[PDB]
Design a protein around this motif. Structure first.
Motif, PDB file in Angstrom:
ATOM      1  N   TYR B 958       0.802  -1.213   0.000  1.00 54.95           N
ATOM      2  CA  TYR B 958       0.000   0.000   0.000  1.00 54.95           C
ATOM      3  C   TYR B 958       0.846   1.280   0.000  1.00 54.95           C
ATOM      4  N   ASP B 959       2.019   1.261   0.624  1.00 56.70           N
ATOM      5  CA  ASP B 959       2.869   2.445   0.622  1.00 56.70           C
ATOM      6  C   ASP B 959       3.813   2.413  -0.562  1.00 56.70           C
ATOM      7  N   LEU B 960       4.129   1.210  -1.031  1.00 57.43           N
ATOM      8  CA  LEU B 960       4.906   1.066  -2.252  1.00 57.43           C
ATOM      9  C   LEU B 960       4.008   1.494  -3.440  1.00 57.43           C
ATOM     10  N   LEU B 961       2.700   1.270  -3.266  1.00 58.86           N
ATOM     11  CA  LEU B 961       1.629   1.686  -4.159  1.00 58.86           C
ATOM     12  C   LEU B 961       1.517   3.188  -4.128  1.00 58.86           C
ATOM     13  N   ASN B 962       1.561   3.769  -2.928  1.00 53.70           N
ATOM     14  CA  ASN B 962       1.544   5.217  -2.793  1.00 53.70           C
ATOM     15  C   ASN B 962       2.719   5.840  -3.561  1.00 53.70           C
ATOM     16  N   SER B 963       3.888   5.181  -3.544  1.00 55.01           N
ATOM     17  CA  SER B 963       5.028   5.652  -4.335  1.00 55.01           C
ATOM     18  C   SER B 963       4.867   5.340  -5.818  1.00 55.01           C
ATOM     19  N   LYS B 964       4.088   4.302  -6.128  1.00 50.29           N
ATOM     20  CA  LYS B 964       3.804   3.866  -7.493  1.00 50.29           C
ATOM     21  C   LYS B 964       5.082   3.450  -8.194  1.00 50.29           C
ATOM     22  N   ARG B 965       5.770   2.475  -7.608  1.00 48.98           N
ATOM     23  CA  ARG B 965       7.045   2.023  -8.150  1.00 48.98           C
ATOM     24  C   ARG B 965       7.012   0.573  -8.632  1.00 48.98           C
ATOM     25  N   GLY B 966       8.190   0.011  -8.876  1.00 45.46           N
ATOM     26  CA  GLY B 966       8.336  -1.381  -9.282  1.00 45.46           C
ATOM     27  C   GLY B 966       8.279  -2.353  -8.099  1.00 45.46           C
ATOM     28  N   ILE B 967       7.100  -2.911  -7.800  1.00 43.60           N
ATOM     29  CA  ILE B 967       6.980  -3.881  -6.698  1.00 43.60           C
ATOM     30  C   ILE B 967       6.925  -5.303  -7.215  1.00 43.60           C
ATOM     31  N   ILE B 968       7.843  -6.128  -6.725  1.00 44.08           N
ATOM     32  CA  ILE B 968       7.940  -7.515  -7.128  1.00 44.08           C
ATOM     33  C   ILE B 968       7.379  -8.472  -6.077  1.00 44.08           C
ATOM     34  N   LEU B 969       6.394  -9.267  -6.448  1.00 46.85           N
ATOM     35  CA  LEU B 969       5.889 -10.280  -5.536  1.00 46.85           C
ATOM     36  C   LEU B 969       6.645 -11.579  -5.713  1.00 46.85           C
ATOM     37  N   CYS B 970       7.414 -11.994  -4.711  1.00 46.99           N
ATOM     38  CA  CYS B 970       8.224 -13.197  -4.865  1.00 46.99           C
ATOM     39  C   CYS B 970       7.735 -14.375  -4.011  1.00 46.99           C
ATOM     40  N   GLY B 971       7.433 -15.486  -4.675  1.00 49.93           N
ATOM     41  CA  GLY B 971       6.943 -16.705  -4.034  1.00 49.93           C
ATOM     42  C   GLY B 971       6.381 -17.612  -5.112  1.00 49.93           C
ATOM     43  N   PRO B 972       6.303 -18.919  -4.896  1.00 56.07           N
ATOM     44  CA  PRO B 972       5.829 -19.913  -5.843  1.00 56.07           C
ATOM     45  C   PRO B 972       4.295 -19.878  -5.957  1.00 56.07           C
ATOM     46  N   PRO B 973       3.737 -20.305  -7.090  1.00 60.39           N
ATOM     47  CA  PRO B 973       2.317 -20.365  -7.427  1.00 60.39           C
ATOM     48  C   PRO B 973       1.530 -21.080  -6.354  1.00 60.39           C
ATOM     49  N   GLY B 974       0.465 -20.447  -5.869  1.00 61.18           N
ATOM     50  CA  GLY B 974      -0.336 -21.038  -4.808  1.00 61.18           C
ATOM     51  C   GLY B 974       0.176 -20.716  -3.394  1.00 61.18           C
ATOM     52  N   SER B 975       1.386 -20.165  -3.275  1.00 57.61           N
ATOM     53  CA  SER B 975       1.965 -19.832  -1.971  1.00 57.61           C
ATOM     54  C   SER B 975       1.502 -18.524  -1.441  1.00 57.61           C
ATOM     55  N   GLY B 976       1.069 -17.712  -2.360  1.00 58.89           N
ATOM     56  CA  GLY B 976       0.756 -16.347  -2.113  1.00 58.89           C
ATOM     57  C   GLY B 976       0.984 -15.663  -3.434  1.00 58.89           C
ATOM     58  N   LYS B 977       1.902 -16.198  -4.236  1.00 68.34           N
ATOM     59  CA  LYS B 977       2.154 -15.621  -5.560  1.00 68.34           C
ATOM     60  C   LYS B 977       0.895 -15.326  -6.343  1.00 68.34           C
ATOM     61  N   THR B 978       0.074 -16.347  -6.495  1.00 66.43           N
ATOM     62  CA  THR B 978      -1.132 -16.233  -7.274  1.00 66.43           C
ATOM     63  C   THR B 978      -2.320 -15.862  -6.417  1.00 66.43           C
ATOM     64  N   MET B 979      -2.235 -16.186  -5.136  1.00 65.11           N
ATOM     65  CA  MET B 979      -3.284 -15.873  -4.181  1.00 65.11           C
ATOM     66  C   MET B 979      -3.384 -14.361  -4.046  1.00 65.11           C
ATOM     67  N   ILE B 980      -2.220 -13.759  -3.812  1.00 60.43           N
ATOM     68  CA  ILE B 980      -2.052 -12.331  -3.670  1.00 60.43           C
ATOM     69  C   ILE B 980      -2.357 -11.667  -4.963  1.00 60.43           C
ATOM     70  N   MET B 981      -1.812 -12.192  -6.063  1.00 55.87           N
ATOM     71  CA  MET B 981      -2.068 -11.641  -7.386  1.00 55.87           C
ATOM     72  C   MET B 981      -3.552 -11.484  -7.667  1.00 55.87           C
TER      73      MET B 981
END
Lengths: 462, 1122
Positions: B958-981
């Motif tokens: 949300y604060d990285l969003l406020n900056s509107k920058r390059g945020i990388i979500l790192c984790g395997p599919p189903g771990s949070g990678k795709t859940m969060i996505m």
């Protein structure tokens, strides 16, 4: 044996179609003494040997050819009979017998295991025994001209060498054979159009085409295979049309479907000192005859010089630290160099010391960055060159001749090509090359190491 | 068609505005004329394809004229194909060029625009409107014409051109006839110079001195003669005081020859000389001249060994001259007899040691203007076929610079063409069907190849070619005589004294300095040093100080940053005045000030290396910056350019092109096989413009073209001729493109270990390191950015009230310690202060930004206390949220370092204890949504239940969003990678989102193609665009596989290089045009699996200086149980 030969990657990609064709050459397209009826079988066997390896050995490395002689003769000369190795083989393998080079056919004739490995392996204190067999192991059509002069269905698979222009030899063969010297330096659409139409015309015309850079436009092979059959028929279409495949330097993998149908021959730019020398003289004709005739002799010296270099070049690292491809263009160059110093060479006024300096730094002072190697050529100059006839300088190879008022062709043999291969059997001679024999002595064992491994490799089926 | 109209704007358009065109089709041009009143006149502005289509009445004024164009083209095309044939010189240019040459042929000035390809080594022309009386050599020295020639189209440009050459030639030797007579008799060189061109004045001096040395070769006067030329040196040394720089240079070359005579005569003097047969004159060359010749380019003979070569006298003048070393000498004799064999050569050795210089030396010795071919370009053999007609019709001597670096397609295809040419050279076959017609092959052409020690000595040159080439091992030339004679001709007072000390200076340095691979001091560099000597004497250059000043200026700069003491100490060991500080002290001072304005400390190590930038700004034609982006590699350039311009008093003409997202064909041109020409690319069209209008505005402006990458020969080797010394690009059609003295090259890297020293060591290098910025220096930069932090809604009053705890933390060593503690722990991306100072300040300021609204009503001190945990959250997210929860926790232990609240003893840590809008906190305990699945979608993964780590990422986001920058979500599919996505891309209708697929082989174009549906372009009058899918709403592009797209040959992530110019620079190099086009509000974020997994893609150090990232592997059994 073929199956074992085929373990040599694509060098020996020759297969059963060629095998049967090879034997068809044995019984038909070779010698009149190969009639299948017994008892010609002894002679047939000796001629199977000749025909089989005259194609199969040309598809194999010299280290294979050396051991091919050793291995294969158990079948062909002794109808599957074993014999025991001495010197180098014991050194690197064992085999229960050691006696060195100084021994010939003396205590060699034992039971079961015959006198020839007992004899010649003595010789292997330095590996030369594999040629000393003199057991008919010579390529029938060893001469690249003879390779060409075969049945055209066996297209000319020119497997060449890195830094060696085997294509040039083919160019010269076109001219020698007087066939339409066409060359297709594959790589462009126009060259594809040559592969298309130029060849198609040649199919009828009886053209001679050098498919230069056969790998650069390799994709042609996709349809070429039917065109192989087509071109085979096209050879007959004019009984002149020939196709040459060239580019192969080292790691150039060639297709078994064509090695199975073509004449697979590896080009070898490997002349001994006098071999180089004699050929170089023939190539100059009159370059030093042009006044002054003292430069004729100088051209003769340059052939000796380059030849000593071709030996040294092979000896690298023993010879030069860098293996620059010193060639006959450098030799030709030197005769051009002489052609220019004729202004001084009109008589003994030639500044041959200046010329020596230049032979070292002009003629053969090419790729050599290393000052040692520049000094190596320079000390050869000191050893050999002088701007006149009658040079009592290097009697070891017998350069002291009075070949003055006669050219490189006019009286070549008279004083110089009459000479035999004047090369010291026990050395290089490295005093001509100004090199350390130590390396030869090291080569004795280094050769034995590789040879030992390769005989274990091939011998299983020979 | 229109495309033809554009190409044919000249012939059709310009030959109606000026209708001097071949009446054959002019009668069809008359129908064009009636309409060209619109499309050629309005095309004074409206020039391009569609732009001409935008000309009023194009409906027929283009299209009907196109029908007439067709009528015309049916013979016009061939008209200029034949005009091209007529002029060998037209094969050095394209049809568009020719279309315009003939198009406005009345303008003899238009013809002179192509002199670099139409003429030889000629600068300019002495002429009047449509009439000429003389010509200016490339030197600037002039030769008049033997007779006045009219220039106006009338007489027929072919004839015209031939006439021009004729009268020049006549002057070239007729005045030379006089020159020899004058010198041979003994006429003072001042008169001889007054009456003729030096390239051959010297030559006739040599003819005279040849006769005179023959007298001493007969032992008639070796000593006296030696003294005579020595006395002539003394006389000329006095004459060097003449204000004409060209003339004193003229006699400097003469003096060098006299120094050659002091060497050669000296040798002859000191040796039992066997007349001219003694190698001291049989090896050393001699000259002959026949005034009794009618051919005014054929009178002098070049001789040594036993041959005489015909000197050409192509109009050159003074320019180049090499010391006649024994190695140069044997180079010449080798080249000569190779020429006599009609065989080529292959030089093997670096520029600066004669790689090209000795080729050119022979060409100058021959009197030929050698065409140097920078072989690294898109030389399609069809284009070359055109050129071949021109250069064989002439007889141009070919020098192939880095020949083997040209693509095999061409090499094999050309081998067909050049072999026929070679056969003709051997046979004596003039006319050879080249390109499309029998071309009169001139025997003057020759093929000599030259490379800096080729990659490991490899035989890339095919054996069917190589056989006929004689290598030239240019390891070195006799540098002892090169250096000393240069210092001698220089009039350098210590030309022998210092020279011997230089041997010892470099000796000491080689025994003490480190063996940096980013470092070199051979003859190449020495030539730079030799150039520096005289001017350094004027720049406080005390006798020996002169070279140690140079040793401070060059060589050291490149060497590792800790070896400054090596040079100061080792040079002091021989001469105490070990150089001098940047004499233009104000420049490194302005640099410092620029850096202070930039928020950087500008350390003395930095400034000192930058003094070396300024030192080499003058000396080196190209420099390589090695070091940290933002602290050396980039900050150097960033701030030295500001003071650079001041250093020379020039404009700061620097360029930065992202070459790694453009192809070499995009940059240098693609083939147009239908025309047998090739489309000029970005760099090719620019470099042609360098030589036809860009340097017309930036002739003396300081130009530095910046290389934005680690060494990667595919985008480096083309520049090698500059790095070498040659400074030239010759195109596929013979378009030689010289690179001017104000054009320098600036590389930005930290790693050149991607090729051989053959090219690396050809130019200068300035070594930096991360020592250029302490965290304090980096913070001073951040500090200024924290002063300007951040959202405009923030009055910065609230910021100061909160941020000052951070400001105090900046001073605290304990803050420095968390940057080093982060370095001590395992994180998903490399910890970099240019990223983490930004991540931490962005997270903190956006937390503050949300407090801007809250804090307006909240108590100052109470919030100051509340934000001690909150700011620590941003510190414990920026430097910890990017890794595994345990690593994060280990980093969380560093929570005792923040100024506001230094307590490791905090219970639920601040990363858990979330600050609220009313100064309260909310401990981030399990927030797994028990009230979620009740019925219906229980088994549907689309609405899958989250964990506090997947939630955490969003809370951080949300604060990285406020900056509107390059945020990388790192984790395997189903771990949070795709859940969060699934959740993340649905956070709000306020933003546009695009779930972009990035496979290993998905290009930015595959993506862009889709994004063209999902983005818009507000095209401006500048050719720039800008706009997210909907207006304003940021286009939150989502990269679903950030660490999956492949790296190039050297590990460079070119996908991201494009994405960085797309987002960080808000624009892009529209490849089809190579046109930079802008962006409005596009927000690129994404996801990927753990980069720690096998086969995952590495991130560049400079991408780790700008990307944010969050991490979660597969979830715990505890959270899954819930």
């Amino acid at each position: 044996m073929l199956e074992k030969f085929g373990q040599f990657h694509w060098f020996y990609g020759i297969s059963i179609g060629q095998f049967l064709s090879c034997f068809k050459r044995v019984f038909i397209k070779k010698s009149r003494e190969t009639r299948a009826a017994r008892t010609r079988v002894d002679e047939i066997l000796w001629l199977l040997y000749q025909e089989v390896y005259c194609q199969f050995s040309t598809a194999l490395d010299k280290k294979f050819k050396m051991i091919m002689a050793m291995t294969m003769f158990c079948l062909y000369k002794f109808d599957i009979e074993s014999e025991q190795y001495k010197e180098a083989v014991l050194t690197m393998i064992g085999v229960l017998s050691e006696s060195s080079d100084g021994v010939p056919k003396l205590t060699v004739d034992t039971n079961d295991d015959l006198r020839y490995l007992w004899d010649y392996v003595t010789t292997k204190s330095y590996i030369s025994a594999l040629n000393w067999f003199k057991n008919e192991f010579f390529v029938d059509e060893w001469n690249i001209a003879d390779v060409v002069a075969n049945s055209e269905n066996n297209y000319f698979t020119m497997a060449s060498e890195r830094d060696v222009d085997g294509t040039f030899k083919l160019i010269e063969l076109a001219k020698a054979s007087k066939e339409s010297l066409k060359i297709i330096p594959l790589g462009s659409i126009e060259n594809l159009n040559y592969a298309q139409e130029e060849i198609s015309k040649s199919k009828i015309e009886g053209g001679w085409i050098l498919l230069q850079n056969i790998q650069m436009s390799l994709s042609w092979v996709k349809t070429y295979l039917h065109k192989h059959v087509e071109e085979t028929k096209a050879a007959e279409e004019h009984e002149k049309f020939k196709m040459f495949m060239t580019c192969h330097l080292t790691g150039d993998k060639l297709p078994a479907p064509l090695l199975q149908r073509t004449d697979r021959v590896v080009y070898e730019d490997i002349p001994g000192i006098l071999d180089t020398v004699k050929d170089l003289w023939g190539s100059q004709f009159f370059t030093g005859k042009i006044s002054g005739v003292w430069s004729v002799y100088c051209t003769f010296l340059l052939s000796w010089f380059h030849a000593l270099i071709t030996a040294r070049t092979r000896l690298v690292p023993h010879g030069f630290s860098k293996k620059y491809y010193f060639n006959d263009c450098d030799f030709q160059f030197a005769s051009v160099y002489l052609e220019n110093v004729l202004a001084t060479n009109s008589t003994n006024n030639i500044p041959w010391a200046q010329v020596r300096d230049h032979i070292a730094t002009i003629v053969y002072g090419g790729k050599i960055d290393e000052e040692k190697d520049l000094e190596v050529v320079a000390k050869l100059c000191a050893h050999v060159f002088c701007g006149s006839d009658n040079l009592q300088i290097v009697p070891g190879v017998r350069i002291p001749q009075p070949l003055l008022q006669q050219s490189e062709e006019e009286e070549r043999a008279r004083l110089t090509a009459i000479l035999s291969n004047t090369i010291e059997p026990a050395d290089s001679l490295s005093s001509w090359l100004q090199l350390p024999r130590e390396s030869i002595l090291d080569y004795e064992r280094l050769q034995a190491k590789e040879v030992a491994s390769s005989t274990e490799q091939l011998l299983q089926e020979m | 068609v229109q495309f033809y109209w554009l190409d044919l704007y000249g012939i059709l358009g310009e030959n109606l505005d000026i209708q001097n065109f071949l009446p054959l089709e002019t009668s069809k041009f008359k129908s064009l004329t009636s309409e060209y009143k619109m499309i050629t006149t309005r095309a004074f502005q409206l020039d391009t394809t569609i732009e001409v289509i935008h000309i009023p009445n194009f409906d027929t004024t283009l299209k009907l004229t196109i029908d007439s164009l067709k009528m015309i083209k049916s013979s016009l095309s061939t008209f200029l194909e034949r005009q091209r044939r007529q002029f060998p010189r037209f094969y050095f240019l394209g049809n568009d060029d020719l279309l315009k040459i003939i198009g406005s042929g009345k303008h003899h000035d238009q013809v002179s625009k192509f002199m670099k390809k139409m003429f030889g080594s000629i600068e300019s022309i002495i002429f009047f409107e449509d009439s000429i009386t003389g010509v200016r050599s490339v030197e600037g020295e002039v030769l008049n014409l033997n007779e006045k020639i009219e220039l106006k189209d009338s007489i027929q440009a072919q004839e015209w051109l031939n006439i021009l050459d004729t009268e020049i030639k006549l002057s070239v030797f007729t005045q030379f006839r006089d020159c020899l007579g004058q010198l041979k008799d003994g006429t003072d060189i001042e008169v001889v110079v007054s009456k003729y061109i030096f390239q051959a004045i010297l030559l006739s001096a040599q003819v005279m001195w040849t006769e005179l040395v023959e007298k001493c070769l007969q032992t008639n006067e070796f000593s006296k003669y030696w003294k005579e030329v020595d006395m002539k040196i003394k006389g000329l040394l006095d004459k060097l005081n003449k204000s004409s720089d060209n003339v004193k240079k003229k006699i400097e070359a003469l003096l060098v020859e006299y120094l050659h005579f002091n060497n050669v005569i000296g040798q002859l003097k000191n040796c039992s000389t066997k007349e001219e047969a003694r190698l001291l004159w049989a090896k050393v060359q001699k000259f002959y001249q026949k005034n009794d010749t009618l051919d005014d380019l054929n009178s002098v003979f070049i001789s040594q060994s036993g041959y005489l070569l015909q000197y050409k006298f192509e109009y050159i003048g003074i320019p180049e001259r090499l010391i006649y070393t024994p190695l140069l000498l044997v180079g010449f004799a080798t080249l000569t007899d190779s020429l006599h064999q009609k065989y080529g050569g292959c030089f093997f050795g670096p520029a600066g040691t004669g790689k090209t210089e000795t080729v050119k030396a022979f060409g100058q010795n021959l009197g030929r203007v050698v065409v140097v071919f920078n072989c690294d370009d898109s030389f399609d053999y069809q284009v070359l076929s055109r050129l071949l007609v021109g250069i064989t019709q002439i007889g141009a001597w070919g020098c192939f610079d880095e020949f083997n670096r040209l693509d095999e397609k061409v090499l094999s295809a050309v081998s067909a063409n050049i072999q026929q040419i070679q056969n003709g050279l051997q046979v004596g076959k003039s006319h050879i069907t080249l390109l499309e017609e029998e071309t009169p092959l001139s025997p003057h052409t020759a093929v000599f190849i030259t490379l800096n020690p080729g990659y490991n000595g490899r035989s890339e040159l095919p054996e069917n070619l190589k056989k006929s080439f004689r290598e030239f091992s240019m390891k070195s030339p006799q540098s002892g005589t090169i250096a000393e004679m240069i210092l001698q001709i220089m009039g350098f007072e210590d030309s022998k004294s210092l020279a011997s000390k230089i041997v010892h200076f470099l000796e000491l340095l080689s025994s003490k300095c480190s063996s940096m691979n980013h470092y070199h001091f051979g003859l190449r560099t020495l030539k730079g040093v030799l150039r520096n000597c005289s001017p350094l004497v004027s720049e406080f250059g005390e006798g020996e100080k002169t070279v140690v000043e140079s040793l401070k200026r060059v060589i050291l700069p490149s060497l590792g940053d800790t070896d400054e003491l090596v040079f100061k100490d080792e040079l002091s060991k021989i001469f105490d005045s070990a150089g001098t500080p940047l004499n233009s002290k104000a420049i490194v001072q302005c640099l410092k000030d620029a850096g202070q304005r930039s928020g950087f400390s500008m350390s003395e190590e930095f400034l000192k290396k930058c003094m070396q930038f300024y030192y080499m700004q003058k000396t080196q034609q190209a420099l390589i910056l090695v070091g940290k982006a933002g602290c050396g590699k980039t900050a150097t350039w960033k701030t030295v350019i500001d003071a650079m311009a001041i250093f020379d008093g020039h404009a700061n003409v620097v360029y930065v092109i992202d070459t790694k997202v453009l192809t070499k064909e995009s940059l240098y041109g693609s083939m147009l096989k239908a025309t047998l020409e090739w489309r000029d690319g970005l760099f090719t069209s620019i470099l042609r413009r360098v030589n036809d209008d860009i340097t017309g505005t930036f002739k003396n402006s300081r130009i530095w073209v910046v290389f934005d990458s680690d060494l990667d020969p595919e985008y480096v080797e083309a520049m090698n001729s500059v790095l070498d010394d040659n400074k030239i690009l010759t195109l596929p059609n013979g378009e030689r493109l010289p690179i001017p003295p104000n054009f320098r090259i600036l590389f930005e890297t930290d790693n050149l270990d991607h090729t051989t020293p053959a090219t690396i060591t050809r130019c200068g290098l300035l070594w930096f390191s991360t020592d250029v910025c302490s965290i304090s220096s980096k913070i001073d930069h951040l500090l200024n950015k924290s002063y300007e932090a951040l959202d405009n809604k923030l009055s910065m009053f609230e910021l100061d009230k909160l941020k000052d705890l951070i400001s105090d933390s900046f001073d605290m060593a304990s803050l420095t310690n968390i940057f080093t503690c982060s370095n001590d722990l395992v994180h998903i991306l490399g910890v970099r202060t240019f990223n983490k100072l930004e991540t931490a300040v962005q997270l903190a300021v956006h937390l503050i930004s949300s407090y801007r609204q809250w804090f307006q009503n909240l108590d100052d001190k109470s919030l100051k206390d509340v934000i001690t945990l909150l700011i620590k959250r941003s510190l414990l997210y920026a430097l910890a949220g990017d890794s595994t929860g345990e690593s994060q926790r280990a980093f969380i232990q560093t929570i005792n370092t923040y100024f506001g609240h230094d307590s490791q003893e905090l219970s639920d840590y601040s990363t858990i204890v979330i600050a609220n809008d009313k100064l309260s906190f909310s401990s981030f305990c399990s927030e797994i949504p028990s009230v979620s699945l009740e019925a219906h979608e229980v088994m549907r993964p689309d609405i899958v239940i989250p964990t506090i780590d997947t939630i955490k990422h969003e809370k951080i986001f949300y604060d990285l969003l406020n900056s509107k920058r390059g945020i990388i979500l790192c984790g395997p599919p189903g771990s949070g990678k795709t859940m969060i996505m699934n959740n993340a891309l649905r956070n709000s209708s306020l933003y546009d989102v695009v779930g972009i697929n990035f496979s290993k082989d998905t290009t930015t174009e595959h993506i862009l193609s889709a994004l063209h549906r999902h983005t818009n372009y507000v095209t401006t009058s500048k050719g720039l665009t800008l706009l997210p899918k909907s207006d304003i709403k940021n286009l939150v592009l989502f990269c679903d596989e950030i660490n999956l797209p492949k790296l190039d040959k050297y590990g460079s992530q070119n996908v991201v290089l494009f994405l960085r110019q797309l987002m960080e620079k808000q624009g892009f190099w529209k490849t089809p045009e190579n046109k930079w086009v802008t962006i409005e509000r596009i927000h690129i974020v994404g996801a990927c699996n753990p980069p720690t997994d096998p086969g995952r893609i590495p991130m560049s150090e400079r991408f780790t200086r700008h990307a944010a990232i969050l991490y979660l592997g597969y979830p715990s059994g505890k959270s899954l149980s819930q």
